[PDB]
Amino acid sequence: MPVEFSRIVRDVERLIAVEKYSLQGVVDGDKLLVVGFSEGSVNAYLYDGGETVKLNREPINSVLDPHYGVGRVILVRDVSKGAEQHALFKVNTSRPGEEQRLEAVKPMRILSGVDTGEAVVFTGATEDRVALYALDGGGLRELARLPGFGFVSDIRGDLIAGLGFFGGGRVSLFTSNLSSGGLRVFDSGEGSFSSASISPGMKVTAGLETAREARLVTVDPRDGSVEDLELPSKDFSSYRPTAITWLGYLPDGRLAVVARREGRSAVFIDGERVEAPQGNHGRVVLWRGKLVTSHTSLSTPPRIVSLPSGEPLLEGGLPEDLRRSIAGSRLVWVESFDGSRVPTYVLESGRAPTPGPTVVLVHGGPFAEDSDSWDTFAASLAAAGFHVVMPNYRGSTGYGEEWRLKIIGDPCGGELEDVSAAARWARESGLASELYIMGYSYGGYMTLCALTMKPGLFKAGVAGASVVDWEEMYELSDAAFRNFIEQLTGGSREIMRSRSPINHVDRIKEPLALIHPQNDSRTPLKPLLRLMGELLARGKTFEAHIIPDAGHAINTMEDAVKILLPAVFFLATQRER
Amino acid sequence: VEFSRIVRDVERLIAVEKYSLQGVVDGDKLLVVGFSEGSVNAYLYDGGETVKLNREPINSVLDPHYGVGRVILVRDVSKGAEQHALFKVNTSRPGEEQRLEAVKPMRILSGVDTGEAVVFTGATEDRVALYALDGGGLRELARLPGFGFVSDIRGDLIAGLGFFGGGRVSLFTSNLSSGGLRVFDSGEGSFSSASISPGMKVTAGLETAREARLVTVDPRDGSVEDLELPSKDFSSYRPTAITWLGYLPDGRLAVVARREGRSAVFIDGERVEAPQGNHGRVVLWRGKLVTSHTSLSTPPRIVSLPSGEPLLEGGLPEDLRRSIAGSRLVWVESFDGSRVPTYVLESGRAPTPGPTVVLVHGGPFAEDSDSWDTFAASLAAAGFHVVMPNYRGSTGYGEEWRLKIIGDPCGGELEDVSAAARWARESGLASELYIMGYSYGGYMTLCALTMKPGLFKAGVAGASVVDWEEMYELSDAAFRNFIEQLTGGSREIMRSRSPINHVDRIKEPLALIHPQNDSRTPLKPLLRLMGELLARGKTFEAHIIPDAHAINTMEDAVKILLPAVFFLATQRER
Known part of the structure; x- marks a missing residue:
């Protein structure tokens, strides 16, 4: 009858120990930026040429999204022993494990962020306010006060596109300007927005989760008009997804989308379905000309694979x-x-x-x-x-x-x-x-x-x-x-x-x-x-x-x-x- | 070092068989108790091989007299309520337990088996009492003032240690035939152990505010005086505690005494070489001395003196x-x-x-x-x-x-x-x-x-x-x-x-x-x-x-x- 404690411990240990990976972007030309739980702690890595370099020194919580090729990664690290008052640390990708704390930013609950290379845009919550901030050579700036959790989705030129939990459990779309600030909010009577990305023509492409369905839509942030997005392949709308996990434009103009039904996802590029291993997938990036996403399932720990072969680059065993x-x-x-x-x-x-x-x-x-x-x-x-x-x-x-x-x-x-x-x-x-x-x-x-x-x-x-x-x-x-x-x-x-x-x-x-x-x-x-x-x-x-x-x-x-x-x-x- | 490694070691240290020496039976075999994860068993040890005496686990065994052809088991018959029963097992037929139904369940405190009778102390709802069990059923020799423990018997003289009041452990005696109680105070001392000499005096350890004292109490009049021994190793030790003492079947006196958190073994006052640490009871077996041994680096085990070789030791x-x-x-x-x-x-x-x-x-x-x-x-x-x-x-x-x-x-x-x-x-x-x-x-x-x-x-x-x-x-x-x-x-x-x-x-x-x-x-x-x-x-x-x-x-x-x-x-x- 007796509980077999040492066995339980060993098993629990190995399930925590097993490495777990998350795809965050591409930097420095063709280097995957992956956050991974490995060697016992959450860390940031560059992957390329079948090798990894560790970017951080001490454990981190995540990193900001780098637009392609930046030349640096911004680490986010709790400096309050668990209470999620985070700080930002720059690492120049040519000098890994050397961090420069961004002293302009007082510790706060960092909610999200993007690094355009010329500037770092992020959302953060403090005791009195949630807010969109921007940090550049000319110091830190409050772009806009947000009425509730807000998350920066994408930035193209001066347009900033975000998602916002501003009422009723509904998710709104928002936009702002990198130099002039401001805030425009877009609600749907039909549902909530899920993911945003800014098109080459400066329109926000967003997922929209309605009653029992999801679909893709185009918002023009000048006038607030909303139309359905036509895609040149019909596999996406054939799949009839119920939710949208993620979407984003790739550097070559192609729109990657990951949508799901019934707890499993599918990958689409301009509406066409791409072969992907079964389970759920994260973001999609373009690296050395090929598609790459994170993959996970009930039996496989989060890992990093190439599509459509589904073969792993990094994976915990x-x-x-x-x-x-x-x-x-x-x-x-x-x-x-x-x-x-x-x-x-x-x-x-x-x-x-x-x-x-x-x-x-x-x-x-x-x-x-x-x-x-x-x-x-x-x-x-x-x-x-x-x-x-x-x-x-x-x-x-x-x-x-x-x-x-x-x-x-x-x-x-x-x-x-x-x-x-x-x-x-x-x-x-x-x-x-x-x-x-x-x-x-x-x-x-x-x-x-x-x-x-x-x-x-x-x-x-x-x-x-x-x-x-x-x-x-x-x-x-x-x-x-x-x-x-x-x-x-x-x-x-x-x-x-x-x-x-x-x-x-x-x-x-x-x-x-x-x-x-x-x-x-x-x-x-x-x-x-x-x-x-x-x-x-x-x-x-x-x-x-x-x-x-x-914490x-x-x-x-x-x-x-x-x-x-x-x-x-x-x-x-x-x-x- | 991952936690699972620590856990496995901790599991082994908790599970290691610990051994306690109870005496000698069956002519020339050790009676030993094994404890592992708080589950107790009785064994007969002789010559490498060991044999389990009981069926299901027990609380302890009564103290045998040298040679007795049986062991008396003490088992809680109530899942943890400490109301025990007594079970006889003949040393020639291990694994066969005869319950002693004349003794109703009660809190068994201590006991000695002379071979002809079972003498024990126990607590019921309305008393602590000294009992004797023999062919003609159970008798109450004496009602006791507080908890009491039987330490030895020889002839009709029963010797024990009472928690009878005044923050001090008293000596007591009773009589196996006529019963009754006689309490012997200790003014500014407390008794730790008792045994009865061939001459029918009670040797006992008397712990004090400073050094400990080996004394004889004449049970005919309560006179107490220091016991001079043939070898003066013991007086030289200047012990502070006296763990145990008992007469061996050749008449010599075994003392186990403590000082500075370690113990020494003496035989008619002469000190025996023993493994460093602390020792329990000493018995003469096959012509050799044998004791239980423990230290900070070794779980309770059975060793022979003066060599210190383990006879029984948990892996x-x-x-x-x-x-x-x-x-x-x-x-x-x-x-x-x-x-x-x-x-x-x-x-x-x-x-x-x-x-x-x-x-x-x-x-x-x-x-x-x-x-x-x-x-x-x-x-x-x-x-x-x-x-x-x-x-x-x-x-x-x-x-x-x-x-x-x-x-x-x-x-x-x-x-x-x-x-x-x-x-x-x-x-x-x-x-x-x-x-x-x-x-x-x-x-x-x-x-x-x-x-x-x-x-x-x-x-x-x-x-x-x-x-x-x-x-x-x-x-x-x-x-x-x-x-x-x-x-x-x-x-x-x-x-x-x-x-x-x-x-x-x-x-x-x-x-x-x-x-x-x-x-x-x-x-x-x-x-x-x-x-x-x-x-x-x-x-x-x-x-x-x-x-x-x-x-x-x-x-x-x-x-x-x-x-x-x-x-x-x-x-x-x-």
Whole structure:
């Protein structure tokens, strides 16, 4: 019967250790710029000629998008031990591992950014404002104050094109001018914008995610007119995509698009489909004349491949015994309380019987999805001998504006019912002998709402980086996170309070593991402390694990282990009974 | 060094078979108990091969008389409620257990099997009592004033040790035929062990405020006097503790005595060569002396004297034993001219100088001896030297050194801990210093990081006490009293020696490891600490776990030990 701890650790270790890559662009002529988790930390690399050079010294969080060929990379690094107050560091690509901090920019939550080579344009959130900034030889400039999370998408000449969460959970398109500043906002009554790119004719080509469909559109930023984009191949509209992951013009004028349906993507160049390995893909770049994208799946860790051969340039290798810890995967449609079909990804473990111990692993966000993409949490549960049920509850991306916007104004409501229906299905399908719930971020919120609102549905609960109290979280949030909490609770304090697990602790009847980074600035620990005070006060059984010098965005293996390992240890111990 | 490597070693150190010598049976075979992950078994050892005596696991075995053709097992028949039953097993038919149904289930405390009867002590709902079991059923020889333990029998004379009142362990005697009780006080002393001479006097160890004394108590009149021995090695040892003493079947007296955290074996006062560390009982077997042995670098095992060859010893891989590279005693100079006896367990996986943890023992009235300690061993295995200082308040170095902590917590004893750290860097052992500790040790960790910041690179406080004032208020009279005496009934001391009132001064990372639902170590004040840590931007790690007793199983280790080692291993790489 006994939990095999050293095996679990080794497996959890190797799944975190395995290298993971992200495609960020091309620099210095023909050098892939890739961010990768490798040698234990998140780092920036140049790839070319079957070799890598490491650009950074200390671990980083990401880099700004370089337009093709710049001659430098801008690193983004948390200088607040996890609280996501980032700084910018220039690395000249001819002198790798020598960084010059950009002292003009005081630490802030960097949201996005582009480096045109003559200037660096970025969006950032501070305690009082979200804003589009520009930094050049003439110092730093505030181009525009943004009403909510904003993300720079592209820049051509002086035109700047961005995406903005400015109300209702809807995404707006925005533009600005690199020299004169300003802000123009474009809303759609039909839906939300997904990706933007500026055409050679200075029009913004954008994805537009409508009720249950997605499509491409052209916005002229002079007059705000919106028309459909005709493409010279019809494969794109034949594919009838539900969401758009990414689009961008290549240096040769061709429009690359990556769109998806049902948690798998397809690549298109001027509308034509290009052969791509199955799963999901990231951005597409043109390098030494050939197409390159990132690729991932439930069984393959994020890697970098060439299209259409699908052959890898960089890729982390899984050992066969871990490969087999995933017997298979499947997308099933669970019927929820209101009749809605909740599209649910299922990983069958090769170390669990059927029926067997199953965990309902809930995604964060909530504007995120479970898809055919590598998930370490999920793979490690497989490894430990749990089947894994991953419900794309309402609020999820990937299934249309309608399903995504149903969560707005109703946290701990319909989306919890979706999760619950996924649990019920797990048993009734034959898959589950017992149910556990586990989740990070908003998914940890679900765990806590699961255990307060649905006592006795689940056997035990892991809640990481959780939301606990909307009210106290709001007070401790930066401008951008205040606006989003507003957007998500529909500006209601009643919802804020009533839909906070902390005010319902007396109903918990199940064991509960809490995991939290001490310096998380999104989901802070202060409320989690008060929750423990409540649990204790009311005679409830829990364990807690607070991780030092870390926040919501984990960028080292050690932090990754401290986050993941107590979850798996706790679930394995609960399986003993 | 990745965590999985640490975990595997920790699993092996937890799982290693530890051995305890119980006596000799079946004519000429050892009766030994094996413990592994807190699961106990009884064996017969002779000539390499060993045979399990019991079926399912047990709590312990009764003390046999030399040669008896059976062993009496003690097993909890209630899943953990400590209401045991007695099970006889004839030494010629192992694996076959006859329950002794005349003895109703009860808290078995001790017992001796003469071969003709089973004499034992046990607690029921309404008493502690001495019993005898023989062919005609169960009898109560005596109701006892408190918990009592049978140490020996010879003829009709029964000798034991009572926790009968006055903070001192008394000697008692009873009679196997007529029953009854006779208590023998010790004025300013406490008995540690008893055996009965051929001449029908009680030899006993009498521990005192200073040196220990081997005495004879005549049970006919309670006269007590020093026992002169043929060889004067024993008087020369100037022992401070007397672990065990018993007469061998040839009439000679075996004494196991302690001094400075190690032990020596004597036979009619003459000292025998023995492996360095601490020894349990001695028995004559096949004409040779045999004892149990433990040290900081070796798990409890059975060895022959004077050679020290292990007869039975739990397997560890070669490199793991060699990572736990020997112990020594150093006398560390403290702030007031005092020398703190301090045990050091060098790591074979550490350079010199190299990373070093000061592992502060709990209590405070406890001792760090040359004895097996999983915590220390695990730290050595993960490449830290370990330094264990017997700070003032400790036991094992006379009453005076123990009473110096009274009215001075986070004072003299903290200086001792510091001096040990001072000593570790000064002598060349330590390149960098960490402090770690549970219970009072945990309090010490919190005290060191607040009062002496810049001393240790990082700290682990387990089952710590954060605030004397808060804790005094939410606690049972038993504990209120202890606190009152420790802090000298002074609120100034209670407030000022509570590290929660000095969180500001913390400068290095702190790991907290705490039980979630234990009244001796409540969680509430620890949450205040966590709140204060967080408000003031201090780096800390916290592991709060439910049901977090001592560490026996691997589960216990992961709940209480693994987080410490990982935290320190993580801190080591800056």
